[PDB]
Amino acid sequence: LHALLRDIPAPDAEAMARTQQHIDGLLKPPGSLGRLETLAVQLAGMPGLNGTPQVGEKAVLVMCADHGVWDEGVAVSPKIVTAIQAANMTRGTTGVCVLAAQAGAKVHVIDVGIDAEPIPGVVNMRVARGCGNIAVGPAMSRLQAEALLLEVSRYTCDLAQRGVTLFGVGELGMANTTPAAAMVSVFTGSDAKEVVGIGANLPPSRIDNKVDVVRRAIAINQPNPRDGIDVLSKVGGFDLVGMTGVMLGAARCGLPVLLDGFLSYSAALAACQIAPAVRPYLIPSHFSAEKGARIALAHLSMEPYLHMAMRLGEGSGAALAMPIVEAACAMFHNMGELAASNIVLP
Amino acid sequence: LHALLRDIPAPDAEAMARTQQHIDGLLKPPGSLGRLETLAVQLAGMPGLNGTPQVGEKAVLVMCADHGVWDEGVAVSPKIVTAIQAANMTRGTTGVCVLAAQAGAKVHVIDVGIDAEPIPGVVNMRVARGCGNIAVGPAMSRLQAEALLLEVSRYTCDLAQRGVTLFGVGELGMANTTPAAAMVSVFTGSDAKEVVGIGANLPPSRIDNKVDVVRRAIAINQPNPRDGIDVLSKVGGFDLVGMTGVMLGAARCGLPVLLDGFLSYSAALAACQIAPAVRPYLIPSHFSAEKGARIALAHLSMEPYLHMAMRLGEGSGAALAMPIVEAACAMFHNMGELAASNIVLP
Ligand SMILES: O=C(O)c1ccc[n+]([C@@H]2O[C@H](COP(=O)([O-])O)[C@@H](O)[C@H]2O)c1
Ligand SMILES: O=C(O)c1ccc[n+]([C@@H]2O[C@H](COP(=O)([O-])O)[C@@H](O)[C@H]2O)c1
Ligand SMILES: Cc1ccc(N)cc1C
Ligand SMILES: Cc1ccc(N)cc1C
User: Fold this and answer.
1) Which of A168, B136, B202, B282 sits at 20 to 30 Å (Cα–Cα) from A142?
2) Site described as Important for substrate positioning, might be proton acceptor, positions (chains A, B)?
3) Cα(A118)–Cα(B288) distance, integer angstroms
């Protein structure tokens, strides 16, 4: 794992310079395509993309797991929904499946800790039947977190060998916006009340209890903000750890990763804390309707491309933004050039 | 034309109700897909879509024309760029062509007033070789505006008969952000300084002259804010009139139209002034980096889906948002249902 983190490559400034120069000469006023240009340059700096903005195969990895904190009344969705939905993922009837198919991406459903019998068709990496209830103790041991990080990392960079050049990250787990709020609170130094939201339609009357649970989780575990792994293991969850592992794997692989919503923001804060070198590979997708979204995004210094008021999770936002990444590539490779049309601008 | 405006159908509330009910029963927490759900319902209300959110063929109509106000020094791009770029449109090397191709849409380049010889391959509807310089008089006569509105309207709804169900609108014309600013200023009652931007890289030192030109155009023509056609003919342009005509045509056809950037906002303000019934058919795409964008969008009560800091024009933003419209349709038709998985939520 220390080896892993050590070998994450820095962006290729040489390729980025050649990219910027090429974009400036395209048939349009310089910089007129805004963030599409910036995105093309960022991609060009990713070693795994071979010095140019391109997109081969696309995959969305969905990390599924249950949470012990569900028993504290922080979620109105029945617990079995995780297992049921995970099975529906294998049938392509869920939100991510439909949006991923529309984008030409393949969905990988990974069980990292669902509290139910194993589901056929689902990649099995379960650590346990749900993580511990963060309200009275840690979600898992540091060892378990480090092991899952490593496992998911290898799985991720291994897909790279099969033609995948763009990753989308997502999750599935009833009650997970609670440990995500705790994590955000700890990494950004924000108070619980400012980052706890309604998750999957939590009644406004039950928000107070959710805020109290987050505070207790922090007070009891005393997670160290300067140690992302400590934070993930104490007040995180298997699914959040797995999302973090995808980001580390793609970064080690020198490939881009599309973030999803609020849960993904949490995992990204942890990943950047564990290894700052990961940041250049992260690409925002949409702006989650979850209350603590603005704060988490500010500490990540990211501005999402899509404002859809989405809050489903599953990696649906990630899949929705994949066409945007391909648009920057098409712009870069298919537009004509100013010089060829004899156009000279000041 | 009075007939045209009179026959614009109202949205089908019955189909929208059936749509909302179906969306609520899909495999996800109710409302969790945010604006994607709202978009699906809006589409379902459009009579031309046959009571359901669907997308058949897609077209982006680009209105090209030159402006007499170019001689006032409000644009740094040479005048011939309009003619040159219009020709490049027929070769698929421009920004809209590349993004439209990526979306599976066909681009229609229409000349409504380019100051040059006719360009082969371009639909010919030229009113004249450029419109009058709005700084010293009207851009065109009311008759010419009404005639082009009608012409473009018929062309638009005629494409509907050939399988087109989704339109994107765009333009091409050096100096057009000047008449667009004048229009926005007049319709929203905002001062020139608040809505004039840098257009296609206008030097910050030349902004003052541009603001003065807009004020003079308004003072001399005295356009009536309550008469959209009066406004278009006096301080607008052929290209802006044509964009307005596409919106009226699609609305009469009961079909959706995707707006583009700042120029399209101007045309949409005019269209809504001429016929309020047009509003339900308009769909925002991106948030233009032009200074007066926020004001124009506020008066239209629209919140764009994409924040890309784009300012190219051509209908490139419209094409970039087409995948989003198809995503709402895929969501609606391909996701599974809660009841089928035995999931019961409060
Ligand atoms: O991705 C988001 O921004 C998001 C925001 C709110 C809720 N969710 C989803 O809903 C679940 C978490 O909600 P909850 O109330 O059980 O904490 C989980 O399975 C997520 O996929 C996801
Ligand atoms: O669509 C926008 O928001 C947009 C914003 C700024 C500039 N433009 C494009 O640039 C041209 C207008 O810029 P200008 O400086 O000549 O007024 C015209 O051909 C448009 O297609 C377009
Ligand atoms: C100069 C210029 C201005 C606008 C557009 N759409 C394209 C070009 C090349
Ligand atoms: C209840 C619920 C919660 C989250 C998700 N992704 C899906 C469902 C069905």
Assistant:
1) A168
2) 171, 314
3) 49
Q: How far is B220 from chain A (nearest CA, A)?
A: 31
Does A276 contact chain B (CB < 8 Å)? no
Residue numbers belonging to the annotated binding site of A: 85, 171-177, 200, 262, 288, 311-312
| Atom in ligand 4 nearest the alpha carbon of residue A312 | 6
Q: Domain B1-54+327-346 classified CATH 1.10.287.3610? A: no
From which experimental method does this structure derive? Answer: X-ray
Cβ burial of B161 (10 Å; 0-12, 13-18, 19+) is exposed
The CA distance from B325 to B126, in Å, is 32
Shortest distance between the Cα of A259 and any Cα of chain B, in A, equals 16
CATH number for the region B55-326 comes to 3.40.50.10210
Q: Catalytic residues of A, which ones?
A: 314
The boundaries of every CATH 3.40.50.10210 domain in chain B are 55-326
Q: Which two tokens stand for residue A275?
A: 């290894």
Closest CB to B309 among A27, A35, A304: A35
- Nearest by CB to A102, from B34, B320, B330: name it: B330
Walk across the sheet containing A106-113 and list its strands.
Answer: A123-124, A106-113, A57-65, A164-172, A257-258, A282-283
| Cβ pair B242, B157 in contact under 8 A | no
- Write out the two tokens for A266: 């949490």
Residue A35 at interface with chain B, using a CB cutoff of 8 Å: yes
Continuous H helices in chain B = 2-6, 13-24, 35-44, 81-89, 95-102, 142-160, 177-188, 192-195, 207-221, 228-235, 238-253, 262-274, 293-300, 316-334
Strand partners, A170: A62
Q: Is A342 on the interface with B (CB under 8 A)?
A: yes
Sheet order of strands, B57-65 included: B123-124, B106-113, B57-65, B164-172, B257-258, B282-283
